[PDB]
Ligand binder design. Sequence first.
Ligand SMILES: Cc1cc2nc3c(=O)[nH]c(=O)nc-3n(C[C@H](O)[C@H](O)[C@H](O)COP(=O)(O)OP(=O)(O)OC[C@H]3O[C@@H](n4cnc5c(N)ncnc54)[C@H](O)[C@@H]3O)c2cc1C
Ligand SMILES: Cc1cc2nc3c(=O)[nH]c(=O)nc-3n(C[C@H](O)[C@H](O)[C@H](O)COP(=O)(O)OP(=O)(O)OC[C@H]3O[C@@H](n4cnc5c(N)ncnc54)[C@H](O)[C@@H]3O)c2cc1C
Ligand SMILES: Nc1ccn([C@@H]2O[C@H](COP(=O)(O)OP(=O)(O)OC[C@H]3Oc4nc5nc(N)nc(O)c5nc4C(S)=C3S)[C@@H](O)[C@H]2O)c(=O)n1
Ligand code: FES
Ligand code: FES
Ligand code: FES
Ligand code: FES
Lengths: 286, 287, 795, 108, 54, 158, 160
Amino acid sequence: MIPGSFDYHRPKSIADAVALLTKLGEDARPLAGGHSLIPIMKTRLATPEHLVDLRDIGDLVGIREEGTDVVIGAMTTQHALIGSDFLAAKLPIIRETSLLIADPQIRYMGTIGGNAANGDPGNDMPALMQCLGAAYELTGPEGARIVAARDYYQGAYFTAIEPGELLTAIRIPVPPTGHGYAYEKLKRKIGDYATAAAAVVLTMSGGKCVTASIGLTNVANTPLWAEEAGKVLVGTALDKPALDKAVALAEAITAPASDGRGPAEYRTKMAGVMLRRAVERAKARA
Amino acid sequence: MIPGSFDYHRPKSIADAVALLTKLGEDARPLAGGHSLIPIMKTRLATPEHLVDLRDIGDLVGIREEGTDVVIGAMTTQHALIGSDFLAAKLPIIRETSLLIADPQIRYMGTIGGNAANGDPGNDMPALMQCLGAAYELTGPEGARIVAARDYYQGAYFTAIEPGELLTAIRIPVPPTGHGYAYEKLKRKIGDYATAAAAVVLTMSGGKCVTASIGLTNVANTPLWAEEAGKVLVGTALDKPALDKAVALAEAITAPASDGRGPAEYRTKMAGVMLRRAVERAKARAK
Amino acid sequence: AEKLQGMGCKRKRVEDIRFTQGKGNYVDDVKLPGMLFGDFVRSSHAHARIKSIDTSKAKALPGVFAVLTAADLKPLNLHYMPTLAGDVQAVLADEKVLFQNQEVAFVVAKDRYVAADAIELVEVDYEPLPVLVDPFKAMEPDAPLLREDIKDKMTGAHGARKHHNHIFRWEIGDKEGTDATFAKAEVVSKDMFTYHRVHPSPLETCQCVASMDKIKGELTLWGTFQAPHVIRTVVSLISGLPEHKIHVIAPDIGGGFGNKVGAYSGYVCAVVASIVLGVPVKWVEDRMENLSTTSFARDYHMTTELAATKDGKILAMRCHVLADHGAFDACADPSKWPAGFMNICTGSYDMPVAHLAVDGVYTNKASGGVAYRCSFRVTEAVYAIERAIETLAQRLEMDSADLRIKNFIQPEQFPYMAPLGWEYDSGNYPLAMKKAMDTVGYHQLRAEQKAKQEAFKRGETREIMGIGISFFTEIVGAGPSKNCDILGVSMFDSAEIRIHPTGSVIARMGTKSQGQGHETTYAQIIATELGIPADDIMIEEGNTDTAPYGLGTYGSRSTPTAGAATAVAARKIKAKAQMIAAHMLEVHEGDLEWDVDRFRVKGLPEKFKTMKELAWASYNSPPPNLEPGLEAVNYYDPPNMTYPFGAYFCIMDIDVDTGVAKTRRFYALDDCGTRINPMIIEGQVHGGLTEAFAVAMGQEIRYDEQGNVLGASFMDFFLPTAVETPKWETDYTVTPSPHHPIGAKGVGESPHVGGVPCFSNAVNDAYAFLNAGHIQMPHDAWRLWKVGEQLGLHV
Amino acid sequence: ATELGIPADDIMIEEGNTDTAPYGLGTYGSRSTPTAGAATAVAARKIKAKAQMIAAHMLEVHEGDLEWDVDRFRVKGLPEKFKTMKELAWASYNSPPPNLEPGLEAVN
Amino acid sequence: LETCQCVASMDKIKGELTLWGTFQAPHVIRTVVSLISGLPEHKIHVIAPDIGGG
Amino acid sequence: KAHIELTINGHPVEALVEPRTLLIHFIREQQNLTGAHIGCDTSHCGACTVDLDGMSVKSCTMFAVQANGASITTIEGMAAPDGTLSALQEGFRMMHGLQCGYCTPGMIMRSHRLLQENPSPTEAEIRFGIGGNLCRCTGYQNIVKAIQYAAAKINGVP
Amino acid sequence: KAHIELTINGHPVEALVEPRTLLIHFIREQQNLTGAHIGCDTSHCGACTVDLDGMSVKSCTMFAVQANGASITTIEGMAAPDGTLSALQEGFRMMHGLQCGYCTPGMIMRSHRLLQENPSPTEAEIRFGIGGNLCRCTGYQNIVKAIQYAAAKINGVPFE
Ligand SMILES: Cc1cc2nc3c(=O)[nH]c(=O)nc-3n(C[C@H](O)[C@H](O)[C@H](O)COP(=O)(O)OP(=O)(O)OC[C@H]3O[C@@H](n4cnc5c(N)ncnc54)[C@H](O)[C@@H]3O)c2cc1C
Ligand SMILES: Cc1cc2nc3c(=O)[nH]c(=O)nc-3n(C[C@H](O)[C@H](O)[C@H](O)COP(=O)(O)OP(=O)(O)OC[C@H]3O[C@@H](n4cnc5c(N)ncnc54)[C@H](O)[C@@H]3O)c2cc1C
Ligand SMILES: Nc1ccn([C@@H]2O[C@H](COP(=O)(O)OP(=O)(O)OC[C@H]3Oc4nc5nc(N)nc(O)c5nc4C(S)=C3S)[C@@H](O)[C@H]2O)c(=O)n1
Ligand code: FES
Ligand code: FES
Ligand code: FES
Ligand code: FES
């Protein structure tokens, strides 16, 4: 319950926060909503010497459309994502997913950037951002760069970010008007990380699937983008034979943990059932 | 019980205390042992805006032999007076009187200068100082001066001190070796101010009184030096007819209050009884 | 009439005023001058010798005042403490650790933040020993010797002591008769039902504030105690302080659920530390330590058999249990009952003969067993019989409702001597079963279920429907002095009631609420007895200096014991009031009759004295034959237990492809005799059914092969939220207890006792048409997925 | 202590908290010994009478066969058969005679 | 040597008065305070602690 | 130690805190506002819920330094200045929405924000809307009643 | 407010006080050393007596600012660390030198100093020596006995 001692900073700008993180090095961590970091400080699994709170940086908060993308600041809270009627109109999967994350209190504090950056395979946003083909904007001492969500995760708490960088924004391509979408999660209770979950976006024309993308949550040590499973839906009527193929291809890439949610063979099969159910709801929406 | 608020000062020297009392005017009082001032602040009889505490001024405490006098600093405590071997040798009446003042706690704090300056006719030291013919050394913004104890007291809380002055020391001529002395106090209980008390110092040679001096406590709005009463003892054997004349001359200058200690007339008579008894003890001691 | 709020009223709770405003006073709210905070260095190992503890770095940390180890306690003979089960438990580990997270040292610091720092600086050197976690292996010849302090090596069952890991063997019932029945019965129905390890997990953890006043030589001990007087007596016996100088205070308690009966190491260490330091010491455990180091519940492996005729008459029951007690036997029970009241396991049925045997074993786990609304192992007894009824019914090809109805103990049979020794007080089972079946539309549910099964076989649905039945007989109110005691103190309880001159009342009882509403409901009993409004009555519990001695709140005993005492003490006051009335009215006491709130003169009803008038007269004009004042005490030794009962029905739908089960309907009929406060009873039922749902459908504490405790935090331990928790439909019948002064039985544990078999029976029943056999709890989604996987449902 | 044969040091006395102390009229008129001192003796004699009943039950004699010796009841003629007050206080909790309430207390 | 004194504490949340005081007859004081305050006796907790002479 | 200044239940607060001090401990220990409770060590239970700048926050999952500048309401702040209970406090009592009382501060503080988010919620909205708060005693059914009772009272005020 | 640093019962103390705060009130109200008592408003009773730089002082007749830099012992500071009572505290109990207890802290603190001033006092010296301390309960006779008992304990030989 009790964390180790640390020094606490409130930088006023992205530039200042990056300067601090760079100077302080490995012993400093950004502090966003604190609802993954503070819990692991309380267990002393994390014992940073410095916390760099991002609270006073207004440029990190916000939702805007820019070109063919929606750009969401890293400090935008889950509660704000749910509340955004502009996001609901453009990217309605985000509200659906966010309502499946944690509980009201946690959603008031937890941020989209923190959910993306944290590195726990339990987080729901990473696979959704892989499904949507989102890009993460990072700023550090050497300047800006972009890392695809699909390329950001290497393992539990291992990600493509470098020393002294902040994830400043998430850039999400806006799906076509009329697209289908779904996030389908299996969990033990409110607040629980998924036994398995699937994110789907797809478009249809003339009764046939034109595009499909699939993410899978918490059925490996990272989120997964189920590339082949999405591809096999394209050109089909999203009928039983097509879904059986997609389920096979998605199950094949899983490598779940065996924990209180059940053994790895169950979770693999649940990835497939979530996928089936998500594709069906997305089809109907399309 | 609760005094009004004030600012507190701790001057480091006499000169700094005097300057402060001069600057701040009558809203400032010197604080010595506090055992008359703090009780009247607590009843809001006194409401000074400043207290000038003399405690850090080491110069004000002491008992010194100088010339033919003993000089006692104003901040010297009753307890210190009692404990002085030197005073017990040269001025034994001081211990005797001090042991009739107040109580142990009060005597730890209360000072000779505060007893002498205070101006309450109930204080014991004033009339002892008049008996002894002491001189008070005062330092003010206008410099030093001396006022005889016999000239220092004009009324209840009305003394010869002027604005900005401190009483710094009491200068007491050392009486002859072998002198008699006594301080005889009538009081209702330990710590009570006298119904009446008498201080006596006298000398004898060959069955006859050579010198005598009498002070009377708390039987007028001031201490009293009973000048004529002492003079009429000189040349006599200090027997009952000699004392009758002294008593008459002492009683005649009293003007007591009527309070819980009894009516004025009773207190005048007790001044006479105390005088008789003090003279008898002093005669026995005289030596 | 408006003001009375007596028995039967849905009186709103007096506790709520302070609790809704944050003005309850729970242990961690206590702040005393100079108070320090203590907490433990705990074992990383399940089984190991302690070679060394280095505390020097911790002691040297600014703000640390003491670091206790067993070496400091041994001289005081406090390195072990006694348990309610007649074993001992290690306070601080001495030569070895025996469960993961066991206490090894106790750091005392300026506050909890410094204490936590200082715990991390203590270095323990361990020497690993082989871990024992499977109770089925505990009495094998090569099983590790756990309890070196009390046992020598004994590798079999035929030596002059039992096997070293065998705690006890307890048997009851007619072994020869039962074996003869099973040797010739037409049907023998046998299963091994495991009641998995779970935990009561009250929302407030265990905690105390010890304050030894060294100047006075008096100890004050605030704490989370369900039985504060018992704790006083135990602290006296072990510390050597006399009882009149030990002031135990159980203030408001944030739920207990059986977790707060016994003593824990933290209480002993806080007290020792306070005695050493002369200042108060607070100890508050965190959740992970609560779940992994304080009383677990259940952990019974029950080999359960029924003998029957083919037509469905039950002839006998034979049950043997393997009980996993963890490393120390700390199971709270009356002293003569090492398996509690597990011998209520013949349930609601009239059987001629039965036999029960229970073996307790040590393993490298936390201690406990009796906790979490068990009524002293009644949860296990009821699960055994109500599951066995269902598996028998399957084997007979009978409907299990019909099987129960063919076997129920009939109303005219009460008081009914059951074949394992308990004499049930009263019951009307056929009426309650009928009311329940009619309300849920039972025969129609069965036809609906049959059609859904046919649809499943045709490929038309992936859902299956189960109908769970639990018809149970509880036993609560421990208990008669002949056979019920806690460490030699007979299991009575008590009430003291004092009426003030102006007619208000202070009353205290020997129980202790942890949320059950006693402060409201005891006043309702008095209000009806005396005609004094309930709001004119103050109820207090839990301060051992002031309350009459009692045995505490557990085993749903408050209403049977202290509720009885309350009524009997009030009836003493009434009798004295009658004598005062007779004196005032100048009549014979026999000429008077009670009428609500006054005594009237028979056949001159104009002439009367009210209870308020009589209270004043007791002070103002006391009759010369009598003492002044108006008060009474009763210490109530019950003649028997009370035996409430219930009929619970669960309709459950299960998605075979995910394993996800969803309760459709849950109907709970409870009969606890006279109902003091229907609103409070209903809340007790809602809470107990939610626990039953949690235990049956998800909750567990597990150990791996290395002895690591698994799932002992809210990341994994299933506590339902408002989203998961079903809606509850409740109902009742009223069958008073004939021996109780107001006819009231206990009820608070009934919902859990009955509810777990109801849920588990529903799940088992859903899969019965597929021949799944007995499905072991919990029935979470992965486990139900495995059931279906193994039946070939997924291909 | 004299009434019950329990040392004075094993007895805690309290007064002045109206929630806990039995109702009384207070201390003035030098009344404490005449009134509450009387009540104290009478209440202690009620406990003694109950203790005598417990002793008779435990020793399997009549109450009239018992005699009090400072802090214990002995059987007349058989002084080796006795129960101390301390023993009887435990028995009142541990083995209450079937016609008596558990515990050992009184008010006057 | 100790003068007369008290500490009154009305708990407005609970509707209960606690009254510490220099009372030779605390139960009498309770019953008096009930009669003049209209609070019932079970809600008036009078406490006479150590008293420095009466 | 960091100097903070904030508002709690309408009153200014200033304090010096270690950055690691959790908000729940600053509230209970330094401020002596012991209504808010701790029920867990992993951020699940919600017993520590306070209303902070228009949000329901689990105060065991925030440091006191993060609350610098904030306006916080705890359960002690819910009754009106004349002592009258809030509609929620009254509804929890009327509907028997508590037993041991340990979750009750948190449940009421969450529910205070819930009924600002949605003044007229359905039962499914209530249950979901209190998903971050655990209760061991009640089985939630009467808590839903309590919230519905409070909504009706609030919706009648104007 | 004024800043003061002093020693009380052997422990360092640092505080802020108003100049007009009486020492008795600083001790009782700010330091929570509530053994010292107030029995009067005119400096007669001595119930407020503490030992201050080797003197017996009526702490109701001194401002806390005057005690800056002082060493004070109050009744709480008299018992040994091993729990054993001082000679005086034991003698007061043994000789029944207290009843209500209200004067006792100031009587013991004065007597602590008395016995340093005069370790073997006569009865008349004892009575005079506690003349600044009033008791209402005892009539003083058993107080004199208590102080004699303590002196004889300290001296290892009785006197009167
Ligand atoms: C009880 C509970 C249940 C939960 N349930 C779920 C759930 O169902 N699904 C789900 O997805 N989440 C769940 N969460 C996690 C929650 O969503 C967290 O808010 C999230 O994981 C982290 O976001 P945060 O803003 O709180 O980040 P923090 O906790 O502040 O930080 C998390 C990590 O990310 C780093 N970080 C944060 N922001 C940046 C940045 N901009 N650039 C670089 N590094 C950064 C931090 O340094 C830290 O290492 C749950 C949490 C709790 C306490
Ligand atoms: C209970 C009790 C009983 C007592 N009994 C007696 C008694 O029997 N006989 C008796 O004689 N006294 C008695 N006293 C009075 C006591 O002796 C006081 O100590 C004394 O009157 C004043 O001396 P102090 O040092 O305490 O002066 P303070 O109280 O500090 O000062 C008294 C007054 O003198 C002024 N002052 C002090 N020192 C100086 C100085 N150097 N120069 C100029 N002005 C100064 C102050 O400003 C104030 O106006 C009693 C006191 C008490 C509390
Ligand atoms: N015939 C009856 C029976 C009971 N009641 C009311 O119901 C309440 C529960 O009474 P009872 O059934 O006698 O049970 P106890 O009070 O002895 O409670 C113990 C029981 O309480 C249970 N319910 C709990 N509920 C809360 N909130 N907290 C716990 O710790 C609880 N622990 C569990 C466990 S475990 C146990 S053993 C009391 O207010 C009583 O007046 C009544 O109105 N009529
Ligand atoms: S204490 Fe459990 S969420 Fe805060
Ligand atoms: S009322 Fe007990 S935890 Fe909710
Ligand atoms: S209080 Fe009486 S002398 Fe100080
Ligand atoms: S003991 Fe009571 S005033 Fe002295």
